[PDB]
Symmetry: D3
């Protein structure tokens, strides 16, 4: 397996939006690697979350950690420009949400960001065949985004995705989001995931550091 170093990406949807900078500082001080950014436009999913200004506010506040913007929006091209200027690090989108996937991935790369494709539980991986050189991260949803129980079939899709990336020779992260907890993160990594989104499991816990410490402990006795 030509994987990448493990990374924990809390989704700030579970964070305190009245004290966002403080809450992000606390989870990063607790050892988190990536700030995960769930953007919903009330159309691709039945919910509306936060826009590029929140990414801007985090950068102006001092957050230099990588910000991983997951676009659950459609169409994607215009708002991609705003997240590039707002300081996003990763920009990922669903292939179903863009009429021209290649041009959309190229738009992110030409902005200096790392680009990715997000796969709904039912979405097959076939669309990756002709954009392998243009995706830096692959996100598999283990729940239906925007609507809370881990879909077990995702483990098979994680293993298929890990195989596809390994045979490409390119450095591509395998990200997972949806029902990720301490009790299953060991099994999830064994399927081939190297980038882990957790939300409630971290931000709603009484101690962020122990939970992250518990996750990394399980991740070591996983591979």
């Amino acid at each position: 397996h030509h994987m990448q170093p493990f990374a924990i990406a809390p989704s700030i949807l579970s964070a305190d939006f009245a004290r966002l900078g403080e809450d992000v500082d606390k989870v990063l001080a607790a050892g988190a690697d990536i700030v995960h950014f769930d953007v919903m436009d009330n159309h691709y999913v039945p919910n509306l979350t936060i826009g590029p200004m929140v990414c801007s506010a985090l950068r102006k506040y001092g957050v230099s950690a990588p910000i991983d913007v997951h676009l659950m929006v459609s169409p994607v091209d215009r708002i991609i420009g705003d997240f590039i200027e707002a300081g996003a690090t990763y920009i990922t989108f669903h292939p179903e949400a863009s009429q021209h996937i290649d041009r959309s991935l190229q738009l992110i790369r030409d902005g200096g960001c790392k680009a990715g494709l997000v796969f709904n539980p039912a979405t097959p991986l076939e669309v990756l065949k002709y954009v392998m050189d243009k995706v830096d991260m692959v996100l598999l949803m283990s729940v239906n985004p925007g609507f809370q129980k881990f879909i077990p079939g995702t483990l098979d899709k994680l293993r298929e995705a890990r195989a596809l990336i390994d045979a490409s020779g390119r450095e591509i992260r395998l990200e997972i989001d949806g029902g990720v907890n301490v009790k299953n993160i060991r099994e999830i990594a064994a399927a081939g995931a190297d980038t882990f989104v957790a939300g409630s499991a971290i931000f709603n816990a009484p101690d962020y550091a122990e939970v992250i410490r518990a996750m990394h402990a399980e991740l070591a006795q996983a591979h």
Copy 2:
């Protein structure tokens, strides 16, 4: 002073210009500085070319302790589903654009049945004719003096403010007249004199070095607005 059927003046800062890294703190300062209403600009990247903040941020302000009335301006389309979320999130006012709903009456009724005050937002070009048959169901009328989601006060709004003020005055209903777009200390007197009683300002307050001084200066002009 005057004979209009108005409501007591209210200053409604737009938290679009606030510090989203310290939002609860920033809202506390503007409220402690004399602001009345927290104005909430909700944009869904479809009705306007921008995406701002959803109901979870309104919930976060309520869970933090913000008890001031929260004025949710919906620049989204369609509106009914997200209207429910802002009701459950603790919004006080919910206003939306007539163009954004296929069924304006049902949408207004949805807000009222939540216990909220309802309103219609008017783009610079949108005429006021649609108010004729919903006068009993609007608690506030928001006049946009700029194109929402895109930056200079459009002067013709003063004429529409006067037209809106006249419709409310002759209606017998208690309806707030709100204005948003380029409202600052140098023009708030003329805007109030045109008939607005609810004033949304954004950068003028949140980008100022002292929030209380600016708000006092606004009230200074509002006092000399009906000579």
Copy 3:
């Protein structure tokens, strides 16, 4: 200057397992017009019945005028099918058509009578330049597709009656939403001459008594 009173029950409240039977009974009970509520799950959050049901009633023997209310968007394609299906009136919402005049003209060219439907909030302004092409004006007293009569509708009825009277043309003034025996008198006095009732008729045990009761209130005008 009005048009003769007409009672137009909406078959949304009828028995779709015995539809021909129920329509015969309500018509034999004195109903004038069969009102047809078409919803496309887009313009309103519900899906009801399409032109094949209008077609099925015509093949069954129903010769009464069938009044097709389109709560759909866009409208031009399905207008054609309802022309071929044997519709008598075809009405649609001005917001649902990008080209109101062409859509009204499309109905007239099929031989049907055309109308525009106005949501509770919709002002009557759009009638100014199409008065020659509407045979019926339908005012919604409830939000279509979603149930209590909106009182402000009576004010719009009187404004609508004034516009029709000043046109000199034969245009029906229709009302739909919460119309019952207890209010049909005031609704007619406001200027309505065409009355859609649904639950009030089809859920009653005897159709003839309700319609006879309604005309009694229409008599005290």
Copy 4:
């Protein structure tokens, strides 16, 4: 590893002026499932019948399984209504839902059986990660909503039956579009176990003879 043969007449060809009577006759003539073609004027250029008609069939006494084929987009809201309306199967096209799994999960959580419908050109790959959530697979042998059996459907039937056979799950393989007595044997031999016919049954003078003829050819299939 197929399922018991089932004949599912499509009531688009039935008499909607005497629908309860017409359905009783086809059911008394040996039909197994009432097939329900729902069109929203957007996903296909036609509008047929909504949940109230399914309700009317239940309120009239029809206890047979009602198989609702949703040719609509989006699907989630009307799915809820058909669950309450008393549907037995609810199927939809994968292209018509932005979130296929949540839509399938919606049907199952209502107590209904769920399925995916595939247009003549639509490939079967999308079933790979939803095999546990589909109870029926419907292949269209004509373009839905627009009348001759597309011959390539037999090959897709054989491919679909293999996928279901290799899954170990109880999933019906349904076919709809130009299915008649003269071709139902070959269709069944291709792997279908649920057969939608419309005009072939409801436009016939005796429903029982046509249905009887279909079962005769279904025997001389495999």
Copy 5:
């Protein structure tokens, strides 16, 4: 009546697109004032006509006359930019086709172009009240656009339109389009129109100049 000098604006949909430059030269040399450009995007109307490249092609060829682009498209803002760079003189659009009429009108003005609003046969004139300072032309459709006989009520709307312009004090052209010929141009002008779009009446005539002279002859026996 604060009108503008009469202008004949033949619409090139009736022109020979195999010999467009030649045909435009002839109709202008025959006395036409404005080249009328009908843009349809197959969505706002059931037809697709010509885009900005044809406006560019006429300018690259030498056409210096004012080019009047009527946008029957929705949305309008993106293609407004392209018609500005392509060299349009007027850009007009339908208010129903823009979610933000004022911003769209301002976009045209900021490109250096003249702006306008187009009214379908049923569209009321009410929307002009708060954009009078931003419209240089008002186009009244006397037929349903994109689908051929003058709708008689348009004459009443012209008089209503002319009265609104007269009361504004602004230099605003009153344009008419749909079934305009020599036999009715006098009555149309007396109702208050000062800019006349004709298509087949001119381009299908054997001599373009004779028709234009006849139209200009009828315009004299107007007011």
Copy 6:
């Protein structure tokens, strides 16, 4: 394969003298007049509609006209291009809710039908419509937005294999950054129908460029 064919795209032609320019490119040896139709929705541009195809036929153009539809939805305008005299009509599968019916509409009109594949679009959708496609167009750039995407060669070879294994007569068309310096390799990948725009219509002499292209097509 099919005999090599050069299909200049009239997006690069002179729309003020279109009949003349099309006459010149055909007299210079071009085989097919390529027609790029954009509706400002499927792609961020609006080009030319059926009236222009009709105008070319009324002018005398009897050559095959290849209409590539970058529009969505497609069925209504397919009807218009049939009336206008189109020879090929191709569309993107993502732009039609019912691909088979749309291909069938073209075939029932007497035209040849095809499917266009965006750079990211896989070829999987061809499996059940192989009997209904006369041409397969591979986009080597993002349509409507100009440099040849290298992965297209891999898809060309994969597509050529699918057609070769089908036994059906289907043209393999390529569009996007096709020039004299790369047309040999593209044909070697399996393409037999070549769309060029600027390379031909912006050249000072159309005949020399087309002659130069055919020379490279020979050493394939």
